[PDB]
Every structure is written in C-alpha cells, then in structure tokens.
C-alpha cells in the first residue's frame, strides 16, 4: 500500500546499491589493465615524439574521436562531445570518424554530414595494435586521409586517476614530415619514402596510444561514477528507511482505531 510500495522501492534501491557497488569492483579490475596499457603505449609514443620534437615537424582535415560502445562511464562521452563541437566550430566541414558507439551517437546527432566512417566493437575490448592498424588502413583508403594534410584525433586524457580532460592532438601528415625544419640531420634516402611510411606508422602508433589513454580515462571515470552512484543510493536508503519506520507505526495506529471503534460499541 504505502507499506509494500515503500518496501518494494526500498528493495529496488538496495539492489541498485549492490549493483553500483558491484560495478565499481569490476571497474577496478578493468582499471588496473587499462592504466598498465596506457603507460607502455605512452612510452612507445614518447619514442616517436622524440623524433617529432627534434625534427620540429609540426602540423580538409580529419577529426577522429573515441568513446566506447558502453555508457555509464560518466560524462566521458559528453565532455568529449562538447570538445569535438568546439573544434567543429573551427572547421565545420571536417570529417569525423567515430570510434565506438557513445561518441558515434552523440556526434551523429549534432552533424551527420561529417560522419562518413564510424567503427564499432572497440569499446568492450582493451585497445590492440590489430585494431589500430586495420582502422588506419581503412582511414587512408576510405577517408583519403593523405588528401587532408591535417589529421586530428580526439580522445580522453586521464588527467588524474580521479579526473579526465578530453584532449586532441594533431597527427603528422606526410607533407608535414617532408618540410619539417630539421630533417637534414636525420638521414633521408631516395630508396625510402620515409614520409609515406612514417605517416602511416605514426597514424597507428599515435592512434593506439590515444586509444589506450581514452580507455583508461573511460574505465577510470566509470569507477568514479559507480562509486558516486553507491553513495546516492545510500542517501535514498536513508530517506525511505525513515519513511518505512514511520509507515509501520502508522499501520498499527490505523488498525488500533478500528479495534477501539469496535470496542466502544
């Protein structure tokens, strides 16, 4: 009545608490792998960055963005969406490749013209070279990536293991690599097409790093979110508990009145 609907709702809240707790634990398990990956990947990336720095390479365009298939990871999906939208002011005509369902859906809504290629089946998995390489191979062919002397990728940098700032970076096209200020100290060879190879290689190597960073931020955010969820459920337990206790007393009182009314006669 009151009593059962209170009780059922309180049971729901309890079950929710348990689930959000559970989710938080599984999130932690996943988080360990995610962070580990992000370290190894970043070290590899840094080896490439050493070149780009020393070369002082620098530099339509591509937009690539990444947010997993899965949601309830927090606002990873929508903070990234907002930050994509900000740089979509800059170039409205840029072609957005959406890696994973959550980023796909949100960006698809704001502009569907941009969406030309999109992926799926990424979010549930931990990033792997296999994915990046194949995505890259498709990026060149499908998006005519080389035509665009600008490529830019969006991901979520896991700022702290409690925070995430959505971030973007520019991938270095083969044109950029050619004209890089220092490139003379580095040895080029006419029997190599180091721009055309290095572009391709760093398309993937950077992308894998970006994916690892994103995945870590996503899983970290989810852990944080699922923890905060447990707290919100607890508060709901407390309010309905007081109500439950009050309701119990009230039932006794209403029943008592009937008995008294009977007794009086």
């Amino acid at each position: 009545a009151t009593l059962k609907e209170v009780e059922m709702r309180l049971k729901s809240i309890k079950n929710i608490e348990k689930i959000t707790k559970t989710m938080k634990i599984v999130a932690s398990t996943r988080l360990s792998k995610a962070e580990k990956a992000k370290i190894s990947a970043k070290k590899m990336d840094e080896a490439e960055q050493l070149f780009y720095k020393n070369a002082e390479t620098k530099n339509k365009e591509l937009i690539v963005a990444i947010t997993s298939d899965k949601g309830l990871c927090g606002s990873i999906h929508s903070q990234l969406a907002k930050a994509v939208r900000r740089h979509l002011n800059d170039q409205p005509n840029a072609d957005i490749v959406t890696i994973g369902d959550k980023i796909k859906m949100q960006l698809l809504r704001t502009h569907p013209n941009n969406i030309k290629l999109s992926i799926n089946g990424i979010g549930k998995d931990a990033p792997t070279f296999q994915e990046s390489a194949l995505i890259a191979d498709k990026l060149l062919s499908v998006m005519k990536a080389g035509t665009y002397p600008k490529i830019s990728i969006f991901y979520n940098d896991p700022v702290s293991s409690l925070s995430f700032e959505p971030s973007e970076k520019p991938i270095f096209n083969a044109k950029t690599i050619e004209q890089s200020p220092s490139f003379g100290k580095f040895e080029i060879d006419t029997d190599a097409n180091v721009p055309r190879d290095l572009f391709e290689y760093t398309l993937a190597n950077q992308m894998l790093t970006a994916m690892a960073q994103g995945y870590a931020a996503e899983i970290s955010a989810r852990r944080n979110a699922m923890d905060n969820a447990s707290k919100n459920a607890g508060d709901m337990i407390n309010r309905y508990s007081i109500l439950y206790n009050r309701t119990r007393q009230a039932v006794i009182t209403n029943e008592l009145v009937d008995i008294i009314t009977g007794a009086s006669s």
Partner: protein, 169 residues
C-alpha cells in the same frame, strides 16, 4: 473501492500523472481491464485495434528499460517510437467526442504503421489533416464505414490506399 470492483463487469482506471503528462482524458490502461471482456464495440473498430493492446504493452516494458538510458536495440526502439506515437494519438480534446467512422481510419493508419513513420510533433497535424483528406476525398469511405460498420476487403484496401496517398500528409 474493493466492493465496487467486484460488482462491476469492468473497471476503467484513470491516471492523474498521465493527465498532467497530457493524456487527458487519462486512462490508466494498465489497470483498465474488463474481467468479462469485450464483445461490444464496433466490428470494424475491433478489427483495426487488434494489436493496439500488444503494441502498448510492449511499449510499457520498453519505456521502463529506455529511461535507464541503457543501450536499446532497434527492435525495442521500433516499439518505443511506435508506442510514443500511439500515446500522442490517445490524447483528445475535452468535450469533443469523435465518431467511430472517423476513429477507424486513425487506428488503421497507426496499426498499419503509416502513423509510426510520421514525426511525433506533427502527429496532431497528421490526424487533423488525414481526417480532412478523408472528408474531401474518401468521404465515400467514411459513409461506408458509417453505413456498414464492418470493414470489407474493399474498404480495407481502399483505406490502406488512402493512407498511403496521404502518408506524408
């Protein structure tokens, strides 16, 4: 309330929240039941509204799932979209009843998915206009539904064609 429920052949539960939600008149269709069941209602209208119950029932399950914001498959979102349009169809203006001859088309349109296509905002426009279109053109169709009160093959086909002709208003 317990006593009366036993006594009556059916119950027509109304829901206050749904009144505010805009389904005014507001019928709590989940608790609207007839223990005895139906057999009194126009034969034509019986044919058309056959899966209206199933769609709505599915819509109710689907809607609960949908508000968790959990990933929904297309099949659930077909239901969700269809369900939403049906709800918008249900809403009706106070002190304006609608003749059965002109309720048969609207339910035909919906159940035969024509309504499901057209967008939620302009459902009210579609309803008004569709009726106007039938008043203009298939006024023969309306006359026949009024006169014979059960849909023949010819009427069903005519009606299907009519809806198709005016499908995108």
């Amino acid at each position: 309330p317990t006593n009366v429920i036993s006594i009556t052949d059916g119950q027509i539960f109304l829901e206050a929240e749904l009144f505010y939600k805009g389904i005014r008149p507001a019928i709590n269709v989940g608790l609207s039941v007839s223990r005895v069941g139906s057999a009194a209602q126009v034969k034509a209208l019986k044919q058309v509204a056959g899966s209206l119950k199933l769609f709505l029932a599915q819509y109710r399950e689907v809607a609960a799932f949908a508000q968790f914001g959990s990933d929904l498959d297309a099949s659930t979102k077909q239901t969700l979209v269809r369900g939403e349009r049906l709800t918008q169809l249900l809403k009706q203006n106070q002190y304006s009843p609608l003749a059965t001859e002109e309720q048969v088309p609207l339910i035909y349109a919906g159940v035969n998915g024509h309504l499901d296509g057209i967008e939620l905002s302009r459902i009210g426009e579609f309803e008004s206009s569709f009726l106007s279109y039938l008043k203009s053109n298939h006024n023969e169709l309306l006359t026949e539904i009024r006169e014979k009160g059960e849909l023949s093959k010819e009427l069903l086909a005519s009606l299907k064609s009519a809806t198709e002709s005016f499908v995108a208003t």
